[PDB]
Design an enzyme around this catalytic site. Structure first.
Site, PDB file in Angstrom:
ATOM      1  N   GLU A   1       0.932  -1.093   0.096  1.00  0.00           N
ATOM      2  CA  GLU A   1      -0.071  -0.107   0.100  1.00  0.00           C
ATOM      3  C   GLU A   1       0.939   1.162  -0.046  1.00  0.00           C
ATOM      4  OE1 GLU A   1      -0.263   1.801   4.247  1.00  0.00           O
ATOM      5  OE2 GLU A   1      -0.909   2.429   2.400  1.00  0.00           O
TER       6      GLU A   1
ATOM      7  N   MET B   1      -4.112  -2.324  -2.545  1.00  0.00           N
ATOM      8  CA  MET B   1      -5.354  -2.707  -1.789  1.00  0.00           C
ATOM      9  C   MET B   1      -5.524  -4.021  -1.272  1.00  0.00           C
ATOM     10  SD  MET B   1      -6.752   0.179  -2.263  1.00  0.00           S
ATOM     11  CE  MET B   1      -5.056   0.871  -2.122  1.00  0.00           C
TER      12      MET B   1
ATOM     13  N   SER C   1      -5.936  -4.920   2.702  1.00  0.00           N
ATOM     14  CA  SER C   1      -7.148  -5.582   3.016  1.00  0.00           C
ATOM     15  C   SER C   1      -6.859  -6.875   3.921  1.00  0.00           C
ATOM     16  CB  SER C   1      -7.903  -6.275   1.913  1.00  0.00           C
ATOM     17  OG  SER C   1      -8.371  -5.274   0.836  1.00  0.00           O
TER      18      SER C   1
ATOM     19  N   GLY D   1     -17.326  -3.994  -5.774  1.00  0.00           N
ATOM     20  CA  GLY D   1     -16.114  -3.217  -5.839  1.00  0.00           C
ATOM     21  C   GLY D   1     -14.858  -4.054  -5.237  1.00  0.00           C
TER      22      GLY D   1
ATOM     23  N   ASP E   1     -16.242  -6.717  -9.480  1.00  0.00           N
ATOM     24  CA  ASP E   1     -15.359  -5.521  -9.925  1.00  0.00           C
ATOM     25  C   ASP E   1     -15.489  -5.394 -11.585  1.00  0.00           C
ATOM     26  OD1 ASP E   1     -12.992  -3.586  -9.794  1.00  0.00           O
ATOM     27  OD2 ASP E   1     -13.015  -3.797  -7.607  1.00  0.00           O
TER      28      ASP E   1
ATOM     29  N   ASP F   1     -20.306  -3.284 -13.897  1.00  0.00           N
ATOM     30  CA  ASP F   1     -20.426  -2.050 -13.650  1.00  0.00           C
ATOM     31  C   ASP F   1     -21.136  -1.461 -12.710  1.00  0.00           C
ATOM     32  OD1 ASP F   1     -20.423   0.911 -13.559  1.00  0.00           O
ATOM     33  OD2 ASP F   1     -20.953   1.344 -15.695  1.00  0.00           O
ATOM     34  N   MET F   2     -20.783  -1.362 -11.396  1.00  0.00           N
ATOM     35  CA  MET F   2     -21.616  -1.138 -10.152  1.00  0.00           C
ATOM     36  C   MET F   2     -22.533   0.057 -10.374  1.00  0.00           C
ATOM     37  SD  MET F   2     -18.766   0.037  -7.583  1.00  0.00           S
ATOM     38  CE  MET F   2     -17.913   1.613  -7.759  1.00  0.00           C
TER      39      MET F   2
ATOM     40  N   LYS G   1     -15.976  -1.803   0.729  1.00  0.00           N
ATOM     41  CA  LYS G   1     -15.029  -1.492   1.351  1.00  0.00           C
ATOM     42  C   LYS G   1     -14.106  -0.547   0.452  1.00  0.00           C
ATOM     43  CE  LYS G   1     -10.689  -3.331   3.405  1.00  0.00           C
ATOM     44  NZ  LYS G   1     -10.016  -3.268   2.136  1.00  0.00           N
TER      45      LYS G   1
ATOM     46  N   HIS H   1     -15.908   6.020  -0.340  1.00  0.00           N
ATOM     47  CA  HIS H   1     -14.937   7.346  -0.246  1.00  0.00           C
ATOM     48  C   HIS H   1     -14.210   7.900  -1.505  1.00  0.00           C
ATOM     49  CE1 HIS H   1     -10.659   5.306   0.508  1.00  0.00           C
ATOM     50  NE2 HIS H   1     -11.342   4.794  -0.849  1.00  0.00           N
TER      51      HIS H   1
END
Ligand SMILES: Nc1ncnc2c1ncn2[C@@H]1O[C@H](CSCC[C@H](N)C(=O)O)[C@@H](O)[C@H]1O
Ligand SMILES: Nc1ncnc2c1ncn2[C@@H]1O[C@H](CSCC[C@H](N)C(=O)O)[C@@H](O)[C@H]1O
Ligand SMILES: COc1cc2c(cc1O)[C@@H]1Cc3ccc(OC)c(O)c3CN1CC2
Ligand SMILES: COc1cc2c(cc1O)[C@@H]1Cc3ccc(OC)c(O)c3CN1CC2
Lengths: 354, 344
Positions: B107, B161, B165, B189, B212, B232-233, B246, B250
């Site tokens: 990360e 990520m 995680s 996602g 995803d 595609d969410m 998660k 944001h």
């Protein structure tokens, strides 16, 4: 634990890039204009940025930068009773300057601050060099700047006018700050009639020396691409050339922030060229942040470690040196009577006598 | 005093770039293979780098990097010319664990990657110019579009990520028991699926689904008990009994978050829940882990994606309520990390 350390380690890239943004947006100067002990909101600061005047969201974005600088103690953070005094949520805190951020406010009289040097050391050309830092460990004779840009830094500057400006201005304005400190402590210029600044940049350093000591005939010597953009300064003559080929004759010489860019053989070659161009009784002054004999948690140590890491990335052989190491270079080039003179927080004048 | 403040300000760019070089050189793992309590010289560390074996000057260069990190409390420094370096609490978190290779390295390599730093060079655009995004100004595309055409960045981001995680879920499982008696979980996602793989390992009756974009799913590993689905969410989410979001909300502004959450609501049964996992912005900021754990991604998302920001509990509740969710349960986990349950 991991989720304590995420904060301690993850903030390290974020703080300098937030600081750079704030400097580019002139935040510190804008706060200073509200006066002594000013505490102002993002909205008030943004109101003073003409470029933001059609962006309703500008203050909220600015506050996201400023609150990180507040958490980092670069800005002070507070509120008022009027803001405190149940169904309304005040997002905007007030920011004030600190000892560190006062050094980012251009002075009213002449615009001087640490901004120009800090914009150089976080410039993309420098950071791109730092992305290749590991190459110095892995690869014999690799230089990170050369890996990043395909040329050495002074050769690159002759091809890239924006970088040339950023570097030259960073050195020049920082020079003013340093010479103010030198002139408070060091009296060795008083008796001089001529001073040649070898690798003097755009001539700012010798312009300030001649302004303080008007009997000194000042000469500034640097590479052609620096001299071509140097201002006309009172009492300064500009000379273009290559200090490793030939240094102009001068009664006394200055090498400020020059030796630290080069390895020992190059430094001795340059110092021998200076020796050859000095009269009997002449001196060369070395001005550098000296590496302390024992490193610690103090300004003197960091003032040397910062340029030590930058020069490792930027030029072959460049490094910070101890007093002993500078003495050895002067002695190898024929100088005698080394006199180290502490100025401030690791900055020294070291006199080498012919 | 200018020449006191030069040290405080000038070190800010140097420390992270020294740290990146030390992580790329695997310095912290090399110290750890002498023993976790070991104190070793630059020469001893360099002797374990095969790439340095024909470079007499390697150790001296390495020492110049390490002494800055030792001055910055990332390494300990001690005398036995060569100083000896040891790990600290912070640098222990940069040693790939002997059991599974996990650490903060991936990360931290992502957040200091050139793609991210180049976005931060454009950060002032977000203040000056309405609707600008620093990443777009720097690169000519939005970040998830860029990832689809740039495999190296896609790998660095996905791996950052995924490994992060794992340490996050280790913390979640210490505090939070709400996965028990779930039978199916859709990670919306979900990245390369590491999160849902860890949940299914702890809760073996959960049928896990990782959802995803195609460019992520096509590089995702096979994990036991995890089915990958691409889509595609914002268009639609697969039906799922429970969902996880998660580090998704944001990245997006309010309208996009409400659209996504309504897609989730439509795809949940009566009685289903969506779990939000985020670092929550605290009501007072200071020089502490909870504060920085939110401010770091708040600045990164400001640079990286339109509308992205960190949020308070109240702000998360407002998003769920706008999407039709009727009970919000915030559960603190560690240093600002929360699980927030939204109930249908
Ligand atoms: N071969 C060479 N001949 C002359 N000047 C050189 C040179 N190689 C580099 N320099 C100059 O060395 C300077 C180093 S930076 C320091 C500038 C100035 N003395 C100051 O202290 O602010 C630059 O201006 C660079 O152009
Ligand atoms: N329109 C979309 N549909 C589905 N996934 C999307 C998307 N836009 C972005 N994403 C995915 O959102 C993820 C955000 S990063 C977080 C990944 C994972 N949930 C974790 O916590 O580690 C990325 O994997 C990205 O590809
Ligand atoms: C304490 O903080 C600092 C100290 C110093 C510098 C920058 C800092 O931020 C600059 C950095 C630098 C980079 C490249 C140079 O030549 C290629 C060069 O001469 C200098 C000068 N030094 C002077 C000492
Ligand atoms: C505390 O330190 C950190 C915290 C966090 C991140 C990185 C940090 O270093 C990353 C940064 C990041 C960047 C872009 C993203 O989407 C485009 C994204 O989801 C994340 C996730 N967040 C999770 C929280």
């Amino acid at each position: 634990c991991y989720l304590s350390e995420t904060a301690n380690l993850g903030k390290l890239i974020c703080i300098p890039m937030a600081l750079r943004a704030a400097m580019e947006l002139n935040v510190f100067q804008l706060i200073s204009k509200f006066g002594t002990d000013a505490k102002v909101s993002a909205s008030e600061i943004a109101s003073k940025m003409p470029n933001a005047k059609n962006n309703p969201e500008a203050a909220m974005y600015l506050d996201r930068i400023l609150r990180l600088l507040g958490a980092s103690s670069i800005l002070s953070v507070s509120t008022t009773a009027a803001s405190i005094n149940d169904d309304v949520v005040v997002h905007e805190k007030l920011y004030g300057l600190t000892n560190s951020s006062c050094c980012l406010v251009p002075r009213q009289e002449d615009g001087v601050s640490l901004v120009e040097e800090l914009l150089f050391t976080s410039d993309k050309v420098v950071v791109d060099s730092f992305f290749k830092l590991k190459c110095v460990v892995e690869e014999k004779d690799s230089v990170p700047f050369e890996v990043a840009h395909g040329a050495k830094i002074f050769e690159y500057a002759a091809t890239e006018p924006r970088m040339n400006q950023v570097f030259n201005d960073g050195m020049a304005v920082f020079s003013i700050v340093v010479f103010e400190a030198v002139f408070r402590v060091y009296d060795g210029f008083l008796d001089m009639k001529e001073l040649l600044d070898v690798g003097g940049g755009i001539g700012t350093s010798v312009s300030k020396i001649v302004a303080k000591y008007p009997l000194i005939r000042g000469v500034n010597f640097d590479l052609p691409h620096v001299i071509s953009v140097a201002p006309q300064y009172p009492g300064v003559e500009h000379v273009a050339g290559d200090m490793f080929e030939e240094v102009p004759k001068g009664q006394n010489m200055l090498l400020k922030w020059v030796l630290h860019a080069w390895g020992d053989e190059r430094c001795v070659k340059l110092l021998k060229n200076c020796w050859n161009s000095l009269p009997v009784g002449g001196k060369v002054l070395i001005i550098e942040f000296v590496l302390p004999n024992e490193l610690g948690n103090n300004a003197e140590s960091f003032n040397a470690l910062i340029p030590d890491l930058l020069l490792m990335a930027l030029n072959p052989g460049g490094k910070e040196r101890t007093i002993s190491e500078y003495d050895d270079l002067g002695k190898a080039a024929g100088f005698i009577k080394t006199i180290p003179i502490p100025i401030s927080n690791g900055l020294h004048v070291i006199e080498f006598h012919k």
